[PDB]
Design a protein around this ligand. Structure first.
Ligand SMILES: *[C@@H]1O[C@H](CO)[C@@H](O[C@@H]2O[C@H](CO)[C@@H](O[C@@H]3O[C@H](CO[C@H]4O[C@H](CO)[C@@H](O)[C@H](O[C@H]5O[C@H](CO)[C@@H](O)[C@H](O)[C@@H]5O)[C@@H]4O)[C@@H](O)[C@H](O[C@H]4O[C@H](CO)[C@@H](O)[C@H](O)[C@@H]4O)[C@@H]3O)[C@H](O)[C@H]2NC(C)=O)[C@H](O)[C@H]1NC(C)=O
Ligand SMILES: *[C@@H]1O[C@H](CO)[C@@H](O)[C@H](O)[C@H]1NC(C)=O
Length: 443
């Protein structure tokens, strides 16, 4: 009764955490590149810094499919048809990749990010049944997708391998590689329709292409960036024959929520979520609205604890405009960068739950407290406390030599709070309507 005691049971383990992150696809990287130098550095710091930012540990890039950079389109490394799929692809590398190469180089070389996930939303138009990287259509040569122009399946595998090679030659290792996005959805923008059976057919072609290549690191193939857990779970049966040839399951949080554990041997990443419809809000908590930082801290909780996610990526990091599609507002007029409390929600996770952490059991939670715990590779134990009540006296212990704690709330952005430590037990005052992380350090 001297506070509520949370007890971590290290002997009960769950999934590994690969990390937390976002994207700068569809020219959002270009928006960041336009800022003055101080704004560029502030945007990169708030995304990736483990000292003064969210410490995001994963970057997701788009493999551009478009003929040019009209609108927000991502130009392809091979934007012009070679006529026949038997002819060498025509590579036209611009040394930029829609400004994503720069963001990647900063993430890796400046901030120590080690996980780079490159995903194509479509093949180039000349490889597809409709001849266009937009408006759906399918990769020519897959079962049920004949094209007058012939079979482009091996050409698409060669093209994806070459994109990874261009990154390698620019000193960035792509670690994970996707070849579809929302394969169940036709849209006005870059989109491509594959069945689950077609995804397995293509993995059988892509895997040996990667393995035979001159790539120094062979990236892990991912599938399939469906728009929700329910749609992705429907694809896993057909994928199971190629489980030896890919190593990551990906899905978003749009058409359904990440609320159950999918039946796959692979780690599962939630690779895109956002309040796409909402006008810009910056607040941590007011009433649990769809754009509030509090809401997003709880969305991450749900994906990890209920959805068995090993990673969580918000859709976009920094971009211009007054929607909640992003975490960090760019004001091009002012040359300024202003994080929302959605950035700090994701960072309140990512700063303390580092890649390779193992989720472990913690008991003592309640109506007012939701808790989760993570054992980092360095032996630190991060205990997440999401508090929907008033200030709460909490003790945190293992069933350690020191402790620290940080909170995010309406007044704090991952700000240190007192963690009073005696004989292995941390005592904190978890602020009202906060997400607090208490970290127990080993001797
Ligand atoms: C939440 O999400 C996580 C993923 O993030 C899910 O974790 C996965 O859980 C499954 C089920 O427990 C794990 O599968 C098991 O893996 C073990 C370990 O295999 C490795 O080490 C073995 C030595 O200890 C070794 O023999 C294995 O080698 C084989 O497998 C590799 C890989 O396929 C292959 O290359 C080799 O040639 C071998 O064939 C491997 O290196 C494995 O031992 C399990 O199988 C045995 O035991 C089961 C009974 O538990 C039995 O039924 C089998 O017949 C067999 O005897 C099994 O495959 C998987 O590794 C986890 N994935 C990750 C990434 O951690 C988790 O399940 C999700 N939770 C929920 C609630 O859904
Ligand atoms: C790999 O590199 C060698 C030597 O440069 C080259 O001859 C070969 O064609 C390359 N293979 C591919 C698939 O790029």
């Amino acid at each position: 009764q001297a506070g509520t005691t949370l007890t971590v049971d290290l002997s009960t383990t769950y999934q590994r955490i690969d990390g937390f992150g976002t994207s700068e696809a569809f020219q959002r990287a270009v928006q960041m590149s336009r800022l003055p130098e101080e704004g560029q550095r502030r945007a990169l710091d708030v995304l990736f810094s483990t000292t003064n930012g969210a410490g995001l540990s994963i970057l997701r890039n788009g493999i551009g499919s478009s003929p040019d950079m009209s609108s927000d389109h991502m130009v392809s490394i091979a934007p012009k048809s070679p006529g026949s799929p038997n002819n060498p692809l025509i590579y036209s590398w611009d040394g930029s990749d829609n400004k994503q190469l720069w963001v990647s180089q900063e993430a890796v070389h400046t901030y120590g990010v080690k996980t780079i996930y490159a995903d194509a939303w479509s093949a180039p138009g000349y490889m597809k049944t409709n001849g266009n990287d937009a408006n759906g259509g399918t990769l020519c040569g897959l079962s049920g997708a004949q094209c007058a122009s012939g079979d482009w399946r091996q050409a698409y595998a060669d093209y994806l391998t070459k994109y990874v090679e261009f990154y390698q030659e620019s000193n960035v290792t792509v670690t994970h590689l996707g070849f579809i996005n929302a394969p169940e959805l036709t849209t006005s923008y870059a989109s491509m329709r594959f069945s689950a059976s077609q995804a397995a057919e293509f993995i059988r072609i892509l895997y040996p292409t990667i393995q035979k290549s001159n790539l120094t690191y062979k990236p892990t193939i991912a599938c399939c960036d469906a728009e929700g857990w329910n749609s992705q779970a429907g694809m896993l049966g057909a994928l199971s024959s190629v489980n030896s040839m890919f190593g990551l399951v990906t899905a978003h949080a749009y058409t359904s929520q990440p609320g159950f554990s999918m039946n796959t041997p692979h780690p599962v990443w939630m690779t895109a979520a956002a309040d796409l419809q909402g006008a810009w809000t910056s607040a941590w908590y007011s009433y649990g609205g769809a754009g509030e930082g509090w809401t997003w801290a709880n969305n991450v909780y749900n994906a990890i604890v209920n959805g068995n996610a090993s990673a969580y990526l918000y859709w976009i990091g920094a971009q211009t405009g007054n929607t909640n599609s992003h975490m960090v507002h760019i004001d091009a007029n002012a040359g300024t960068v202003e994080p929302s409390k959605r950035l700090w929600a994701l960072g309140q996770w990512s700063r303390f739950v580092r890649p390779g952490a193992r989720r472990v059991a913690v008991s003592g939670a309640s109506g007012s407290l939701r808790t989760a715990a993570f054992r980092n590779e360095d032996g630190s134990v991060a205990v997440v406390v999401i508090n929907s009540g008033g200030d709460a006296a909490v003790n945190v212990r293992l069933a350690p030599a020191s402790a620290k704690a940080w909170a995010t709330d309406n007044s704090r952005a991952i700000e240190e709070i007192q963690a009073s430590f005696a004989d292995g037990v941390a005592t904190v005052n978890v602020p009202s309507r906060s997400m607090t992380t208490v970290v127990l350090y080993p001797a």
